[PDB]
Amino acid sequence: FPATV
Amino acid sequence: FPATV
Amino acid sequence: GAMGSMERASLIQKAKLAEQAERYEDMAAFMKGAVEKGEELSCEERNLLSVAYKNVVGGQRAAWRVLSSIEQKSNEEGSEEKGPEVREYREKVETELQGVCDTVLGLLDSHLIKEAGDAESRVFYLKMKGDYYRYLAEVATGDDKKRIIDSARSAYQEAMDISKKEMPPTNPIRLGLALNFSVFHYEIANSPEEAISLAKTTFDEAMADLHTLSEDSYKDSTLIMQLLRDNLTLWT
Amino acid sequence: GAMGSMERASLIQKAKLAEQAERYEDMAAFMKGAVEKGEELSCEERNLLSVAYKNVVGGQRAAWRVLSSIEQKSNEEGSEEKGPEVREYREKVETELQGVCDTVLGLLDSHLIKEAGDAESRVFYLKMKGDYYRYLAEVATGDDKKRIIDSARSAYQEAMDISKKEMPPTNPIRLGLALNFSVFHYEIANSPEEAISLAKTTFDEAMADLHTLSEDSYKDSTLIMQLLRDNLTLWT
Ligand SMILES: *CC(=O)NCC1CCN(C(=O)C2(Nc3ccccc3)CCNCC2)CC1
Ligand SMILES: *CC(=O)NCC1CCN(C(=O)C2(Nc3ccccc3)CCNCC2)CC1
Ligand SMILES: [Mg+2]
Ligand SMILES: [Mg+2]
Ligand SMILES: [Mg+2]
Ligand SMILES: [Mg+2]
Numbered sequence: 245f246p247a248t249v
Numbered sequence: 250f251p252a253t254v
Numbered sequence: 255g256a257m258g259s260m261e262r263a264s265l266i267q268k269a270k271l272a273e274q275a276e277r278y279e280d281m282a283a284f285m286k287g288a289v290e291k292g293e294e295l296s297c298e299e300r301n302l303l304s305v306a307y308k309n310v311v312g313g314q315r316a317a318w319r320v321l322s323s324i325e326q327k328s329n330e331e332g333s334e335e336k337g338p339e340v341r342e343y344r345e346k347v348e349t350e351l352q353g354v355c356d357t358v359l360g361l362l363d364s365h366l367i368k369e370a371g372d373a374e375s376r377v378f379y380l381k382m383k384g385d386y387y388r389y390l391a392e393v394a395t396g397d398d399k400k401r402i403i404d405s406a407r408s409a410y411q412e413a414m415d416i417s418k419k420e421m422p423p424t425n426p427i428r429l430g431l432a433l434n435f436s437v438f439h440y441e442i443a444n445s446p447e448e449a450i451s452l453a454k455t456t457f458d459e460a461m462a463d464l465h466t467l468s469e470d471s472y473k474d475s476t477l478i479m480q481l482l483r484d485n486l487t488l489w490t
Numbered sequence: 491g492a493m494g495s496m497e498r499a500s501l502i503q504k505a506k507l508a509e510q511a512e513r514y515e516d517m518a519a520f521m522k523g524a525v526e527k528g529e530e531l532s533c534e535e536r537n538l539l540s541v542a543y544k545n546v547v548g549g550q551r552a553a554w555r556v557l558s559s560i561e562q563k564s565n566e567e568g569s570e571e572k573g574p575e576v577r578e579y580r581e582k583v584e585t586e587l588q589g590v591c592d593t594v595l596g597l598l599d600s601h602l603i604k605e606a607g608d609a610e611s612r613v614f615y616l617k618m619k620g621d622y623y624r625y626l627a628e629v630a631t632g633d634d635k636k637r638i639i640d641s642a643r644s645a646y647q648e649a650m651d652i653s654k655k656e657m658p659p660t661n662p663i664r665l666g667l668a669l670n671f672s673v674f675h676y677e678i679a680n681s682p683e684e685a686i687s688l689a690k691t692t693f694d695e696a697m698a699d700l701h702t703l704s705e706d707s708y709k710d711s712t713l714i715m716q717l718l719r720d721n722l723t724l725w726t
Pocket of ligand 5: 581584
């Protein structure tokens with residue numbers, strides 16, 4: 245799963 | 250903190 | 255009960271899904287619903303009940319300790335007055351914790367304990383009763399504190415008496431009961447010597463009975479024996 | 491609002507305590523209460539709001555993915571029929587997730603976005619709007635799925651347009667917006683090339699502007715630049 249902020 | 254189950 | 259319309263088997267199925275999803279509040283609600291159907295619980299079902307509430311109350315206790323620490327610091331000399339908020343929010347978490355404990359104690363009293371005739375089930379429930387009175391004791395500061403402590407002690411003692419009569423010294427329930435009653439002595443009853451004696455004797459009696467066990471039983475028992483050792487290491 | 495009787499400052503104070511105690515549901519409720527006082531939020535307060543809901547919805551999304559996986563497996567050939575329970579419980583978690591998203595979108599619409607005139611605040615809120623439509627899109631399967639996706643895209647695009655005009659390429663809000671809009675492209679809009687192009691261009695434009703920064707600003711910007719790189723590594 246990709247990084248988000 | 251001590252172990253409990 | 256909001257779970258009154260759901261099948262017992264469906265509640266158990268969903269408890270297991272909730273566990274997989276780490277949704278412990280849901281897991282506990284499903285298991286409360288299952289208990290409230292009024293049938294006795296199997297061993298697997300008793301373990302689902304205990305896992306669910308242990309995780310819920312474990313999270314509350316951790317939060318309560320964080321908040322209590324902040325509150326205690328606010329009452330040291332030279333600490334700036336920040337108003338009632340820290341106390342209020344500690345009280346809020348405390349009240350929620352008490353509520354969960356009262357819910358579990360309620361299930362045990364109505365009617366899990368009275369219907370539990372086999373040693374393994376009766377000891378399991380009475381251990382739980384001691385545990386949830388112990389969590390109440392951890393936050394108790396008033397008139398009933400001694401009675402709460404005694405209620406924990408009484409439940410653990412009944413469990414101990416049955417476990418010593420009816421179960422082998424390696425039985426994981428007997429071991430876990432002893433582990434937790436030992437922690438009761440150390441942390442709640444201000445009896446560290448009793449705590450140490452109990453942990454040691456329990457460990458040594460289990461060690462001497464390991465030879466009777468299968469590989470799988472050996473694994474189960476030694477895991478809890480190591481927790482006894484871990485505590486003894488902490489305390490000595 | 492159950493928080494209507496509590497002081498704004500007390501709600502903010504308690505949000506911070508809840509964060510320390512890892513009580514993110516409480517933190518979110520406190521911040522909702524604070525927003526509902528009707529005053530604009532400071533930068534610190536906007537960050538408390540976003541941390542609270544990110545943690546709550548993050549937990550729901552993780553649970554939803556566990557349950558969706560189980561459900562998908564139950565619909566493979568040779569899978570034994572287990573009844574409606576897995577679907578029901580996935581639907582339950584889904585509905586709760588949707589509720590949280592609708593709550594956040596509601597705060598943004600009433601009236602955080604319309605009162606936000608400074609670029610940093612307006613971009614922050616519009617990024618949040620894109621994010622919560624993105625979470626709705628992740629679970630959407632019906633007639634409104636395209637419109638939900640477009641609502642995310644529209645909010646992110648407005649945020650992008652303001653951020654490019656009004657903020658330096660190293661601004662952490664601009665970077666985080668680009669990171670998340672890139673993930674929108676990859677995971678929601680089936681546009682991996684757009685995702686990769688955006689992440690790359692954002693990274694390279696930030697790299698070229700690092701020389702203008704203090705040590706502390708450099709730390710903030712490079713942290714998010716590394717997340718861009720991490721995603722690019724995942725995708726290429
Ligand atoms: C058959 C029955 O009634 N219960 C099964 C036992 C409880 C679960 N268990 C354990 O060893 C763990 N938990 C507990 C141990 C002892 C008392 C209560 C709970 C040990 C800690 N990890 C989770 C399982 C096996 C026997
Ligand atoms: C001043 C203002 O309005 N916001 C402060 C910014 C958001 C918080 N932040 C971050 O770098 C983290 N979070 C976000 C970054 C970008 C957009 C939204 C949130 C980065 C991830 N770790 C937590 C803080 C600094 C600037
Ligand atoms: Mg109290
Ligand atoms: Mg003795
Ligand atoms: Mg649905
Ligand atoms: Mg472009």
